[PDB]
Amino acid sequence: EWTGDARDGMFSGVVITQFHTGQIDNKPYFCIEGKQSAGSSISACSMKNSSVWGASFSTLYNQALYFYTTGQPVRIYYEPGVWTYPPFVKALTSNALVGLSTCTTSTECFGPDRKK
Amino acid sequence: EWTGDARDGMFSGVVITQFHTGQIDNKPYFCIEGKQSAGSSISACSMKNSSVWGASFSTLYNQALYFYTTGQPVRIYYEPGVWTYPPFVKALTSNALVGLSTCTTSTECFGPDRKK
Amino acid sequence: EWTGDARDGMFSGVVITQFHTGQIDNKPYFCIEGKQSAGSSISACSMKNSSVWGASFSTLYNQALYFYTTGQPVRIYYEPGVWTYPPFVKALTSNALVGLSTCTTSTECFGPDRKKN
Amino acid sequence: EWTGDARDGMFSGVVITQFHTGQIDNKPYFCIEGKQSAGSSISACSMKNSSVWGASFSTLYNQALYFYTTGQPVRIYYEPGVWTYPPFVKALTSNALVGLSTCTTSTECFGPDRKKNSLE
Amino acid sequence: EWTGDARDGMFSGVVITQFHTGQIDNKPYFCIEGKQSAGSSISACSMKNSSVWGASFSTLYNQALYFYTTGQPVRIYYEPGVWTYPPFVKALTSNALVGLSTCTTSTECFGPDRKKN
Ligand SMILES: [C]C(=O)[N][C]1[C](O[C][C][C][N-]=[N+]=[N-])O[C]([C][O])[C]([O])[C]1O[C]1O[C]([C][O])[C]([O])[C](O[C@@]2(C([O])=O)[C][C]([O])[C]([N]C(=O)[C][O])[C]([C]([O])[C]([O])[C][O])O2)[C]1[O]
Ligand SMILES: [C]C(=O)[N][C]1[C](O[C][C][C][N-]=[N+]=[N-])O[C]([C][O])[C]([O])[C]1O[C]1O[C]([C][O])[C]([O])[C](O[C@]2(C([O])=O)[C][C]([O])[C]([N]C(=O)[C][O])[C]([C]([O])[C]([O])[C][O])O2)[C]1[O]
Ligand SMILES: [C]C(=O)[N][C]1[C](O[C][C][C][N-]=[N+]=[N-])O[C]([C][O])[C]([O])[C]1O[C]1O[C]([C][O])[C]([O])[C](O[C@]2(C([O])=O)[C][C]([O])[C]([N]C(=O)[C][O])[C]([C]([O])[C]([O])[C][O])O2)[C]1[O]
Ligand SMILES: [C]C(=O)[N][C]1[C](O[C][C][C][N-]=[N+]=[N-])O[C]([C][O])[C]([O])[C]1O[C]1O[C]([C][O])[C]([O])[C](O[C@]2(C([O])=O)[C][C]([O])[C]([N]C(=O)[C][O])[C]([C]([O])[C]([O])[C][O])O2)[C]1[O]
């Protein structure tokens, strides 16, 4: 697997506006929410020692909280359909957070594309 | 188990006003106290390596200290009756700290409801 | 053992003014000095992987450096006679740092008391 | 191996301007981009438990994010040809980040040179 | 072994002005450079998992970067002759960083002396 795999998906020029941390199945997790200037919203969660993307938890939490603090427009890389516990998906999202990037414009950000 | 389980409980729109850290039974712990603008108060502790909520100790420590620093209104997810050692409950609380969220309003905060 | 055991002791409303880190017997340690006002000094050190209170080293380091930075009056929970290497005690203290609390006044602080009955 | 080995290479007086984090093959990684005074770019990636430079991931991540925050002109030490997965190299770089230093000038920086020797 | 051992040595009232991090022999390390009021210079490196002082790497990195950020005058505790790889020593120093202290004056700092007899 790779953050820059030709898959869904990414949202660019996102300001991280909301932050939530919790626990499920003996694993700490965090979720972020971001809004583009056009009003489009994206939610993505990361879990410690989880499925495929668990190894990134520590780095993503640090980066996400950093980006929440500065308020800078960033790129959210996500993989849909990862989290499957229905009440979790309902209240939050099925999206796993798979990467983060700084942006130069609302569409142009550092690093790989993640798109079909 | 999950932060968003249909149980007690959560306080929304809380400013974290007090912070305590210590050790019991070879386990580090921290407790927070927070006030809602109505002056209503909530206490919760997180303890490393404890039974159910111990896994999220360091994540919650980092996040609670972050929120204490910013002074922003947040949501405290707790579970009552977790700590049972009487002098500990008397001095602090039985409530385990179970999650944290940023809030858009005094009652509306990011993530799941923890509601019985 | 517990931070809030009815034992010696605690110093409430302390501004942490001094900070030191070193190593002894393959173990990193930090130590703090602060004044009440009042005016009296308290010193306490925490040591990684130390016998009784080693579990709290990482948390207390983080919290102590935070409180040193803000300058806010805080409570120092300590256990006397923990550190025993005589030059260490002479230059620093025998006091182990066993907990920290935020304070509302110079004596009223969040969390348990640590005092003898 | 050593950061100060007589090899390619180093860029001095670099301001870290871009930051990216991700995962590949079950390993977290971060990448940085920086600009020198004239606008010339250098990219370098650090990857946890990777090749020979994997041990430095945590320190480099902390230090690079620190310098990104301050906007200090810094020395980027790098080793080309380390990352070999083609889409990764194409999107980012083959350069591994192998060191960081503060700088007193745009060209004078603390610590060793990472430089090929010249021929007499 | 201890930071406050009667050995070489210490520089008091230094401002940490330069910071370097890298890797040698699969070990992450960092080095600092500090200047005293008079202009006198001191360099010291801390290396993860290396020699007797390796256990302090994380604490010392955290504390040195903190002190570099504040720019406050501090005490560098060091041990000369620890690093032996000639190109490393030439480009940086043989001195291992063994401890750090806040200072009240240019000579008076918190904690032990590290002085020869
Ligand atoms: C510029 C750019 O950006 N590009 C493009 C263009 O091209 C041109 C050429 C030049 N180049 N330079 N660089 O074109 C245009 C038309 O006019 C367009 O197409 C563009 O693109 C863009 O767009 C935008 C708006 O529409 C958007 O879409 C973008 O994308 C994204 C981002 O943001 O980035 C991508 C993707 O991934 C996403 N997602 C999906 O698809 C699913 O997941 C999208 C969306 O959806 C989101 O964001 C929400 O809104 O988008 C682009 O880039
Ligand atoms: C969120 C909100 O706002 N909700 C509600 C409403 O609904 C609407 C819908 C939603 N969505 N939107 N979009 O409605 C209204 C009228 O009807 C109201 O009711 C609201 O509610 C509220 O209220 C209040 C009072 O009355 C309160 O309750 C709140 O919250 C809480 C918080 O804080 O969060 C919830 C609960 O959970 C809690 N807790 C408990 O129960 C314990 O465990 C509460 C209280 O009690 C506390 O806080 C104390 O103070 O609250 C709500 O929400
Ligand atoms: C010192 C100096 O500066 N060096 C040199 C000189 O020398 C002088 C004498 C000795 N003594 N003192 N100390 O010389 C000159 C002529 O003759 C020259 O060569 C110099 O060099 C320089 O140059 C420049 C040009 O622009 C540059 O190159 C510099 O730097 C660098 C940095 O940045 O650091 C170095 C190197 O390493 C690099 N890299 C490479 O090569 C590969 O990697 C370079 C470049 O390329 C970059 O940066 C881009 O821009 O550069 C030098 O130093
Ligand atoms: C207190 C003090 O400071 N000391 C002294 C004095 O006092 C005496 C009395 C008793 N004590 N009190 N308690 O006196 C004076 C006049 O005589 C003097 O001597 C002093 O001393 C000082 O001096 C200075 C100049 O010379 C210096 O030396 C100082 O310090 C040091 C530091 O910095 O810390 C010390 C030592 O350790 C060092 N090092 C060595 O030796 C080797 O490592 C020194 C030097 O060398 C350096 O720094 C260079 O710069 O110094 C003293 O303290």
Side-chain angles (χ1 to χ4, degrees):
Chain A
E1 90 292 1
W2 177 43
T3 301
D5 281 347
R7 293 169 60 82
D8 287 330
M10 68 192 183
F11 274 45
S12 304
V14 163
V15 178
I16 298 173
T17 51
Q18 306 196 78
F19 210 102
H20 159 75
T21 65
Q23 188 181 310
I24 186 160
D25 282 342
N26 212 30
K27 303 294 193 286
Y29 73 88
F30 85 95
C31 302
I32 51 166
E33 204 268 303
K35 281 184 197 289
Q36 292 173 327
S37 59
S40 265
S41 175
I42 183 73
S43 299
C45 304
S46 170
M47 222 150 293
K48 190 161 166 276
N49 303 132
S50 71
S51 194
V52 200
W53 306 102
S56 286
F57 173 83
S58 192
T59 307
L60 290 172
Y61 172 86
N62 287 344
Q63 275 305 302
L65 189 58
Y66 181 89
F67 289 146
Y68 173 78
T69 313
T70 63
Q72 65 192 286
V74 296
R75 175 174 285 172
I76 306 297
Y77 295 86
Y78 69 95
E79 190 192 4
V82 172
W83 318 123
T84 52
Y85 184 58
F88 186 99
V89 184
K90 188 199 195 74
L92 288 153
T93 188
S94 77
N95 298 336
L97 185 67
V98 309
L100 287 161
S101 280
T102 56
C103 300
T104 39
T105 68
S106 67
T107 52
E108 304 297 312
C109 312
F110 186 55
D113 287 342
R114 187 182 177 85
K115 56 201 292 187
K116 293 194 288 190
Chain B
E1 86 294 350
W2 177 44
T3 306
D5 284 349
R7 288 161 59 79
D8 286 332
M10 66 189 184
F11 276 39
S12 299
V14 177
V15 174
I16 297 166
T17 54
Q18 302 295 322
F19 211 107
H20 163 69
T21 199
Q23 186 184 302
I24 182 160
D25 201 38
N26 203 52
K27 297 177 187 302
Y29 74 88
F30 79 93
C31 307
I32 52 170
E33 195 264 302
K35 305 274 187 188
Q36 291 169 326
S37 47
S40 194
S41 192
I42 181 77
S43 284
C45 305
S46 177
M47 190 185 302
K48 194 190 184 179
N49 293 325
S50 71
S51 46
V52 43
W53 305 108
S56 61
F57 167 81
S58 66
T59 300
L60 287 168
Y61 170 80
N62 286 334
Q63 199 62 229
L65 186 65
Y66 177 91
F67 284 145
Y68 174 78
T69 309
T70 65
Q72 68 187 283
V74 299
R75 175 174 287 172
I76 278 83
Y77 295 86
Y78 69 95
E79 197 202 327
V82 170
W83 318 123
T84 56
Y85 179 62
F88 189 98
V89 185
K90 190 183 182 65
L92 294 152
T93 192
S94 69
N95 299 333
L97 180 59
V98 165
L100 292 167
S101 287
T102 52
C103 298
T104 46
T105 78
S106 64
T107 62
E108 198 186 70
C109 311
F110 186 52
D113 287 342
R114 185 172 178 89
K115 210 176 281 188
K116 187 181 70 177
Chain C
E1 92 295 353
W2 174 46
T3 300
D5 286 336
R7 300 170 58 88
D8 288 338
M10 74 192 175
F11 270 58
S12 299
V14 174
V15 177
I16 298 161
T17 44
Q18 301 258 64
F19 210 100
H20 169 254
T21 75
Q23 190 187 296
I24 188 162
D25 295 333
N26 204 242
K27 294 173 186 288
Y29 71 83
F30 80 90
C31 209
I32 46 166
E33 195 273 314
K35 320 264 273 181
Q36 307 182 114
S37 146
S40 56
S41 272
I42 178 72
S43 297
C45 323
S46 178
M47 197 172 301
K48 190 183 168 185
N49 293 132
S50 76
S51 198
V52 191
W53 304 99
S56 291
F57 169 78
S58 77
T59 309
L60 291 169
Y61 176 76
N62 284 344
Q63 204 57 235
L65 193 63
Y66 182 89
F67 289 145
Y68 172 80
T69 307
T70 69
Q72 65 190 279
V74 297
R75 180 176 284 169
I76 282 87
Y77 296 88
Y78 67 91
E79 165 91 349
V82 170
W83 318 123
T84 54
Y85 182 62
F88 185 98
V89 179
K90 187 189 176 76
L92 293 152
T93 184
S94 68
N95 296 341
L97 185 62
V98 313
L100 288 163
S101 283
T102 56
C103 302
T104 173
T105 75
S106 72
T107 208
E108 298 283 311
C109 310
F110 183 53
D113 285 344
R114 187 182 177 84
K115 60 145 76 84
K116 283 192 279 193
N117 272 50
Chain D
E1 94 297 356
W2 173 44
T3 295
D5 281 340
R7 289 172 63 88
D8 285 332
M10 63 182 191
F11 271 46
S12 298
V14 179
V15 175
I16 301 166
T17 51
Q18 300 299 308
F19 216 101
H20 166 249
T21 194
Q23 186 177 307
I24 184 165
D25 201 44
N26 200 45
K27 272 103 161 54
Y29 74 85
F30 80 94
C31 188
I32 57 164
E33 193 263 323
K35 301 268 191 193
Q36 285 169 319
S37 305
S40 74
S41 283
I42 180 72
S43 294
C45 305
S46 176
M47 195 181 297
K48 196 180 178 181
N49 314 132
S50 65
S51 302
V52 77
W53 308 103
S56 287
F57 174 80
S58 272
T59 308
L60 289 172
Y61 173 78
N62 288 12
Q63 201 57 235
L65 186 65
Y66 179 94
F67 289 142
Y68 174 74
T69 312
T70 65
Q72 282 171 253
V74 294
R75 181 170 283 174
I76 275 80
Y77 298 81
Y78 71 97
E79 192 171 72
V82 175
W83 320 121
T84 60
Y85 181 59
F88 186 99
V89 175
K90 200 176 183 299
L92 295 156
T93 182
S94 78
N95 299 340
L97 186 62
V98 312
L100 291 163
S101 289
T102 52
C103 300
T104 58
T105 74
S106 65
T107 210
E108 289 289 321
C109 309
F110 187 56
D113 291 340
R114 185 179 177 82
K115 207 178 192 181
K116 284 197 286 187
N117 286 132
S118 55
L119 184 69
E120 181 205 357
Chain E
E1 90 298 346
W2 175 45
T3 300
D5 282 345
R7 284 178 56 76
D8 279 347
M10 52 163 44
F11 269 48
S12 299
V14 322
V15 173
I16 299 166
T17 49
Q18 309 193 74
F19 209 101
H20 166 70
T21 193
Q23 188 180 296
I24 184 170
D25 206 8
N26 207 31
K27 305 300 174 187
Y29 71 88
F30 81 94
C31 303
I32 50 169
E33 200 262 309
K35 291 276 191 178
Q36 276 169 325
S37 292
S40 261
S41 173
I42 182 75
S43 292
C45 304
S46 179
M47 195 180 298
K48 193 185 183 178
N49 289 146
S50 304
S51 76
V52 290
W53 307 105
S56 292
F57 170 80
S58 275
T59 305
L60 289 168
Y61 169 84
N62 278 344
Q63 201 60 53
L65 185 65
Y66 180 86
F67 286 144
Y68 170 81
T69 310
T70 67
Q72 66 193 283
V74 293
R75 177 175 285 173
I76 308 298
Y77 297 85
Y78 70 95
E79 199 204 307
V82 175
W83 320 122
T84 52
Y85 184 56
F88 187 99
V89 176
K90 191 194 174 70
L92 290 154
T93 181
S94 73
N95 300 334
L97 185 63
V98 313
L100 293 158
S101 277
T102 54
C103 299
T104 46
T105 67
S106 64
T107 57
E108 308 285 294
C109 310
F110 181 55
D113 288 344
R114 187 176 180 85
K115 276 205 181 91
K116 266 180 169 286
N117 275 36

